[PDB]
Design a protein around this motif. Sequence first.
Motif, PDB file in Angstrom:
ATOM      1  N   UNK A  52      31.130  42.946  40.614  1.00 56.88           N
ATOM      2  CA  UNK A  52      30.307  42.350  39.522  1.00 56.88           C
ATOM      3  C   UNK A  52      30.988  42.646  38.189  1.00 56.88           C
ATOM      4  N   UNK A  53      31.696  43.741  38.108  1.00 55.42           N
ATOM      5  CA  UNK A  53      32.387  44.087  36.838  1.00 55.42           C
ATOM      6  C   UNK A  53      33.462  43.043  36.534  1.00 55.42           C
ATOM      7  N   UNK A  54      34.306  42.759  37.485  1.00 56.69           N
ATOM      8  CA  UNK A  54      35.390  41.759  37.251  1.00 56.69           C
ATOM      9  C   UNK A  54      34.833  40.336  37.148  1.00 56.69           C
ATOM     10  N   UNK A  55      33.734  40.090  37.771  1.00 55.07           N
ATOM     11  CA  UNK A  55      33.161  38.714  37.792  1.00 55.07           C
ATOM     12  C   UNK A  55      32.611  38.268  36.427  1.00 55.07           C
ATOM     13  N   UNK A  56      31.765  39.023  35.778  1.00 54.06           N
ATOM     14  CA  UNK A  56      31.226  38.552  34.486  1.00 54.06           C
ATOM     15  C   UNK A  56      32.315  38.580  33.386  1.00 54.06           C
ATOM     16  N   UNK A  57      33.244  39.525  33.394  1.00 53.61           N
ATOM     17  CA  UNK A  57      34.273  39.540  32.316  1.00 53.61           C
ATOM     18  C   UNK A  57      35.251  38.369  32.478  1.00 53.61           C
ATOM     19  N   UNK A  61      35.407  33.325  30.212  1.00 53.02           N
ATOM     20  CA  UNK A  61      36.268  32.176  29.815  1.00 53.02           C
ATOM     21  C   UNK A  61      37.242  31.870  30.960  1.00 53.02           C
ATOM     22  N   UNK A  62      36.932  30.902  31.784  1.00 56.18           N
ATOM     23  CA  UNK A  62      37.848  30.577  32.912  1.00 56.18           C
ATOM     24  C   UNK A  62      37.555  29.171  33.414  1.00 56.18           C
TER      25      UNK A  62
END
Length: 129
Positions: A52-57, A61-62
Motif C-alpha cells: 500500500x505504501x508503494x501503491x498510493x505514492x 502521477x502515473x
Amino acid sequence: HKCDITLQEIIKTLNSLTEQKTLCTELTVTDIFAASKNTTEKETFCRAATVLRQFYSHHEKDTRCLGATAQQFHRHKQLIRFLKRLDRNLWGLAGLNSCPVKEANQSTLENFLERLKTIMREKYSKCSS
C-alpha cells in the motif's frame, strides 16, 4: 491485554475504502498472500503495508486510472491519500518494519483490501490472549 484504540480507528478507514472503492480496484499489486502457512498477522501487516505504501505514492502521477474525468481525478488523489494514511499507521498497528522479500507472484488490489481486512477482523476480534 484488551483491544486498543489504534485498531478500532484503522478499521474505520480500511472500511471506508471497501464501501467506497473509487480507486478502481482490480489494478494488481504485490501478492503478499501466497503463504497459507498462517504467517503472524503482524507480519502480513508488515509486508502488506509495504505494498500500500508503494501503491498510493507511485499511482499519484502515473496516468494509471488517474481519472480521465477531471472530476474522477479528485477521487484518485483522495483515495491514494487515504491509502497512505493507512501505510504510515499500519506500521504501528503491525509491530514490525523489516520484511524485504520478492513475491514474483501477483494479486489484485481489490483482493489486497479484502485479504488485508480479513486479518484485521481476526486481530481486532481477538485482541485478548
